[PDB]
Amino acid sequence: DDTSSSINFLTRVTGIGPSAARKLVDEGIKTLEDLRKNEDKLNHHQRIGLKYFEDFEKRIPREEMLQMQDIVLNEVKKLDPEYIATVCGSFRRGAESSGDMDVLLTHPNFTSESSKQPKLLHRVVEQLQKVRFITDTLSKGETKFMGVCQLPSENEYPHRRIDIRLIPKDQYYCGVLYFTGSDIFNKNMRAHALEKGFTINEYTIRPLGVTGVAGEPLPVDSEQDIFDYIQWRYREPKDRSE
């Protein structure tokens, strides 16, 4: 229906999922003039999404990502040069434009054994907000932050989505690799490993055993190591299309 048409639209709102879009249509909330008017029935996230509906439909150009990643790397370095920050996504692969920013972050103090340190992530969010790069928050957990940022003007940029994830240092590389993609690439490399007697997921790489259902993480200090384990020439992110 021209109304099903409505759920389609809604769901284009960050924060607004289906079940969630369904109901607002029962409340008779379809256009977003509807929504604007009715902030009271939306959560913080949905509201933020609504707030930058437009801006969020815009794609990010490399030049912008470049600058964005520098603010981010620069600032985290100031807090503690021992922090490792990596901007992933197609961007890392050379992409000419992007849809949002995905920052993977880590620290040697934080390992999968530790597993418990929000301040580690909060400290940086805070610093980014203080710099005024991060302008809003959608949601913010102990290990993941979803928000909005904006390059500063001097005279305007649209608001963009940014995500910061804090991963244990011991799973960081698998993670970066993983979030680096592409999808196919990932698929192709998992396939191979397997052929090599290993199973790789976004956090680990473990040797298989007989019967299959086997494991025990091998240490990884770099992306290179994963490729060594299955003995593949290392592929620079740029050669990661498939």
From Swiss-Prot:
Stretches for region DNA-binding: 93-102
Keyword Flavoprotein: no
Top-rank taxon: Eukaryota
Residues bound to K(+) 2: 11, 13, 16
Position of the signal peptide: none
UniProt catalytic activity: DNA(n) + a 2'-deoxyribonucleoside 5'-triphosphate = DNA(n+1) + diphosphate; a 5'-end 2'-deoxyribose-2'-deoxyribonucleotide-DNA = (2E,4S)-4-hydroxypenten-2-al-5-phosphate + a 5'-end 5'-phospho-2'-deoxyribonucleoside-DNA + H(+); 2'-deoxyribonucleotide-(2'-deoxyribose 5'-phosphate)-2'-deoxyribonucleotide-DNA = a 3'-end 2'-deoxyribonucleotide-(2,3-dehydro-2,3-deoxyribose 5'-phosphate)-DNA + a 5'-end 5'-phospho-2'-deoxyribonucleoside-DNA + H(+)
Residues binding Mg(2+) 1, per UniProt: 100, 102
UniProt key word Zinc-finger: no
Any one GO molecular function term: microtubule binding
Domain remarks in the Swiss-Prot or TrEMBL record: Residues 239-252 form a flexible loop which appears to affect the polymerase fidelity.
Protein's name in the database: DNA polymerase beta
Organism of derivation: Rattus norvegicus (Rat)
